Amino acid sequence: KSDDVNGRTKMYKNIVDGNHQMEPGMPESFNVLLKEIRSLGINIELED
Amino acid sequence: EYVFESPKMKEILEKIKKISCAECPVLITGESGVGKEVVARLIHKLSDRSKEPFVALNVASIPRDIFEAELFGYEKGAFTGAVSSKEGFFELADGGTLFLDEIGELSLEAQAKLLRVIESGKFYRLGGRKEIEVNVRILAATNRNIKELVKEGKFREDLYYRLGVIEIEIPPLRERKEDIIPLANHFLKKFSRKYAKEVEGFTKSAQELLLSYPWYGNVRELKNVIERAVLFSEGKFIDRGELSCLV
Amino acid sequence: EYVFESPKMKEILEKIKKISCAECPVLITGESGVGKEVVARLIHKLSDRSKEPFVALNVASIPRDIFEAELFGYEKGAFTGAVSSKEGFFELADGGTLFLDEIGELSLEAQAKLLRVIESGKFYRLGGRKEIEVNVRILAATNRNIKELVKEGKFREDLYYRLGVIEIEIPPLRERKEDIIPLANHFLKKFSRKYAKEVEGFTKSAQELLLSYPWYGNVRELKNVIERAVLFSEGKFIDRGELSCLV
Amino acid sequence: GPEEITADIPNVGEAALSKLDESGIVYIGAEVTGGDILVGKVTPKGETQLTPEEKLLRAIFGEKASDVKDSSLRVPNGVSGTVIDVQVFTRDGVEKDKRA
Amino acid sequence: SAAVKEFFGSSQLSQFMDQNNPLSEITHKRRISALGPGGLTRERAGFEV
Amino acid sequence: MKDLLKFLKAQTKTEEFDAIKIALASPDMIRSWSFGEVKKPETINYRTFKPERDGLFCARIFGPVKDYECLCGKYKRLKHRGVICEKCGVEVTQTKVRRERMGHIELASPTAHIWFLKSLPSRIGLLLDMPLRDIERVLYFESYVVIEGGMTNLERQQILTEEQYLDALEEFGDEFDAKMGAEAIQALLKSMDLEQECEQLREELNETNSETKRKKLTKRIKLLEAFVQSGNKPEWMILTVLPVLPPDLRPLVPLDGGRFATSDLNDLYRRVINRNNRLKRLLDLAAPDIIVRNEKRMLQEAVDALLDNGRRGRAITGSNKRPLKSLADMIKGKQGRFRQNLLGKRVDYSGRSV
Amino acid sequence: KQGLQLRLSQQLAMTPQLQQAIRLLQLSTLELQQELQQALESNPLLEQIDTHEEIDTRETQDSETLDTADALEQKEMPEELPLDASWDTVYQGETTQTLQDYLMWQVELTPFSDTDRAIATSIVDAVDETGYLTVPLEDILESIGDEEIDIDEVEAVLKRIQRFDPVGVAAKDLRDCLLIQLSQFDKTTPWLEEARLIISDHLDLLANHDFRTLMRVTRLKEDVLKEAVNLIQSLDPRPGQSIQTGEPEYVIPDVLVRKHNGHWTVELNSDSIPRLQINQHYASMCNNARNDGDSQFIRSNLQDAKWLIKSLESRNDTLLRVSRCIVEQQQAFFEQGEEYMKPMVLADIAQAVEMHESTISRVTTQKYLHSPRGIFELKYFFSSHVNTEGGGEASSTAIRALVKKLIAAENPAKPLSDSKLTSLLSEQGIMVARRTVAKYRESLSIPPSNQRKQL
DNA sequence: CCAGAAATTGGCACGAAAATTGCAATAAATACAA
DNA sequence: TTGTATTTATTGCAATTTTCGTGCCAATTTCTGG
Ligand SMILES: Nc1ncnc2c1ncn2[C@@H]1O[C@H](COP(=O)(O)OP(=O)(O)OP(=O)(O)O)[C@@H](O)[C@H]1O
């Protein structure tokens, strides 16, 4: 409902098709936060 | 374009086609008037630098004192009288092809000025302290036997092995009996429109005389004879009488 | 990139290794296409001046009347044209190596103009009233027997011992039979890789032919012949027929 | 080039231009709802290269269509009312229209 | 002129007149404020003022 | 990719993970992150309205401004996907890669990281066991510090003023080594050892018994053991390369009239780039040190302002006397990512009324 | 004698003393700013006036460590509420939907297969902002990436896409777009079959405005032809312009011209005039007590900075003088618009300001003037002339304006040709040849006489 | 009504006028130490 | 009483290309008699 860019489109398509099911992903704001923390010279990364 | 009829000319053209992909310098040997410059221009067109400029120079007229000045250019303070920097022939031919007419006549002393430029491609201007790198393909044409000059102590063998990587031989017109009639017809057609004489062809006697003659000046002498015949004829076809310039 | 399979080449390499810390000028003598430039650059690389600029200059490329200006530079007001202070090639290679290519062709007059610079490193510019101290290691290359030219009177004996602290002789390739096969293989590999050719070696008859011809251009002639064969190659293996220019 | 306030918009129907006067501005007393045009304006779209297709379009449908694009003022969605007052402000040296 | 325009247009004590009704305008014009340039702030004001 | 179906299927994947790891970044890591180096402080051309080359919005570094088109326009459609134009250098791909491509800036001289100097207790001062006053004086070119003790009576961390350094230089000559700036601190951090300090502090704690000094020794030993166990290195606390944020996360605000205005982050980046370029030019001409020291101090201050504006001394403000927001401001506070966008957010399929 | 010799000579030297501070006139404001940036980078003694300011900040900042009891102890109110709520309980843009976004939204909600969806994605990628397909289907088939697919599948997917909203989008050419639009109409439409026939078969005749061969071939009357043509003209030639995404681009003027007290005042745009300054801090250490190398360095850099500042000031003065002279000469244009602009060449301006024509040419390159009428170029006011009966002159710009005005007020059934346009200009005193009139008409992209008639 | 016979336009060429750029370091007036 | 180093004061020519107007003519649109 907020910032899963692919999830929004998939949810809308499924609702129109009559299939009330979602495929969640990663919010975009967390990726923005990762980039902003990296811009400070700190190495933060998703593991495995 | 250019007309090639004899088997030797076809073989030369095929070899040129095969070696056009090669960037090696070429040395061409023959006589005066055999068409070495035409072959060089064909080679330049058939290579990948056809769009690139082609600079052909007759090195038999360059003064010895300004030899380095013309070849390498110079800076502002190189000598007296100069106020501005000047480019060199290699730089002017950078990214293209440089052709040298009558390389056999070159002086032995000046042959040392081209020992390193051909291989290394790096040189300094007069009055300068900066090294310049280029990419120029060297073509040389000569009517003299280079190897004989080397053996008789007149040519620098290092420069020979620098240029003697690809060899081309153009036989004179005396071995081109098949390729006399097409050249004569082409020259007649060209000069008929050039001088508005409207002459079409030749008669049997004129063709026989032109074919039987062992031309020494080759294509140049044949073209001059055709031009003189055009200038001094009024008929539709040129007979043997109008060809009185020959022996 | 450089093949040293002959025992003499290994001896030369070991001597070069022993003189890496040696700073004295060296003189190299050999024939055409033996590898004087390669050996000199290997000496330069193995010395303490590996990262220092390596200024290679040919003495014959400078006009006679501006030779001093190109050798030492000039100051302002020295002559009609001395617009500003300019340094010479010796000051250009400060702390590095200066490579005098083809020192044999140098005239007697020029050899008397550089007797104090090599031994002491001090020279005055044209118009400069201050003494210039420079430290450049000098490597000279020649294709002439200088030890005989000093006797014949065509070379100045004073400069011979200034450039005769260390002398290197490169034997001709026709005596270096351990190099012909490896050099031919390396050249064939390089020219096949560059020309997109599907050839990957010689035939046994071709190998026997390459070890019997009396090469005169030595390594350079071998490279030229290999390139000529690669250009006109028509099979995965090169036969004696392609190398018909030898004998 | 300058934007023009005009009543001749190439890409609108005649019904949508019924409420505009000869200067391209709505009449006093008009009842308008969301989506209606209040002031008609056009904007230059540049100098498109005269390709054969562009020449065909200009030949068939006219030149005004191929030179300008619509940038009119429209009633926002969910807004209705009656036009009771119109004011025009013009810079010095610019020609005044009929409404002014 | 710049200082005068800034004061009369973008000061904290210069405000659009409240115009709901006449009482709004009368109340707005008779208003006293402890805030502004040289006054207090609603975070540092206190409890006794 | 060759088959377009798999190519489209593989750009909507979700990354798999089960943990998050944080550490310090070496200059090699920062260089491996980036796609190019930023060299010019310009952003937009204002004549062709296209990004400048090597600028803060360069398409050769950060990506295409249009989907599957390069800057010049030789390659334009999906049939040329994954192709680098040899004329402009722009890849042919999606324009969303401008959200996840970073750049880097090569600094002329080292600069300290303001977070590892001003977050109490100071990490540099705790590792080197020096007061914060001395480190601040050295970093901002107000005093000297000895790097190598030498054969004289100068200690390995002794602070020397101008006159003291002058007389020491004229007395001892070239026996010692004294420096100022971030280079000196980096030299101290690079030349130290951790195991010897650990064992010495452990033996000192074993022998000497105290209350405050025992706490100090415990703090230092904990810091040393943490640094040893972690893969970090002390000299990584001094910046040599500077990361640059992707351009779509710091967009330019367009206004009616064609004015692009400016953003605080872009302004701070431009100031850093200008100072770095001027110092790079000055170092090449062998200019007198009396000017290059001021240039290095200004570069240090600019980097500090970019990383965290207002934490150290004065704060750089805008035209209307408002301090510029830095990266830390974007991260922390009640207006930062955590409070405003991650712990709560606005949603679709919602309404409100009386 | 040929030879490079070093000698002492007594010769005469010409005066090439030029080519200094001359390249600063031909550049625009943006390139001039770039050059100034380079100069500031290379010279430590040059600084430019800025606006950034720095002020001290030492106020304490509240953190979480403040205990809960202390919060209730304090009489003051918190600066920001810890609770995620407002006091009653950086700018970024927004996403916009383009034509391709709308098309992909419709593609997502259509029962396609995976292969068909990839084909549709490629097709929509190959659609421009006017609504037409910019590549042949062969390129799309090549970009699909496998050889198991024919061209009929691509055609079917394209036909499905062409029925999206707007109708006619992703069409190959104009005829295809018009036929697609017509296929959506009902058969009850009166003039449908004739319009369909005209579009399908004879569309170039309508482009050439024949109206004679057209009726002969289609065997129709004049009224039915007019009705069909009006129906065709009611269609949308650019279906992809319903969703308009764009913004106009502007140019910041270099010279401002206004009218005060009935007099034309000309000045420079103060928001864009370049300027520099001398850094006093570095230049204030130029004392002999310091090192001599430092002293010579600072002296050289200060002299260069002062010279550059003088050159910039002179450039600004020259530009202002030239603009003022040009405005003064062309005064009737600013009061009555076009048709009143007198002919002008660089020689007149150079004589008026006592300079060479090269200086005038360089100063007026890529310079823009703002007037109450609009934004123009400084070079726009120079034009040729055509001799007018009685010794007068007529500028080509005025003649073009007159020709456009005459053509814009003609009878549609009888378009005015070059022969009649010359006669109208002949009776006004202008003596302009037919070829020149045709050239002027072509320069305005106006069709010839036979291609402007209407029914 | 229709076919044979008259205006229209844009390419190409001519001379002449106008816009463009390659010349990159100089010279004259003024103050100070012997 | 003078000879030298410093500070301002120098924004124009001459090739050279590009463009201006205008006439000739060949491939298209209009005018008139059986
Ligand atoms: N060991 C080697 N391996 C490969 N190539 C070699 C070797 N020795 C010589 N060559 C080749 O020999 C060629 C000529 O070398 P070089 O320039 O030293 O010749 P030179 O005539 O002695 O030089 P110079 O006259 O310029 O002093 C080069 O193209 C080089 O590749």
Ligand SMILES: Nc1ncnc2c1ncn2[C@@H]1O[C@H](COP(=O)(O)OP(=O)(O)O)[C@@H](O)[C@H]1O
């Ligand atoms: N294939 C050809 N077709 C037409 N003319 C040729 C051909 N070959 C040679 N020639 C003529 O022969 C002449 C030889 O000129 P050039 O090559 O300059 O001198 P040389 O032959 O002595 O090198 C040229 O002028 C050219 O016209």
Ligand SMILES: [Zn+2]
């Ligand atoms: Zn490109």
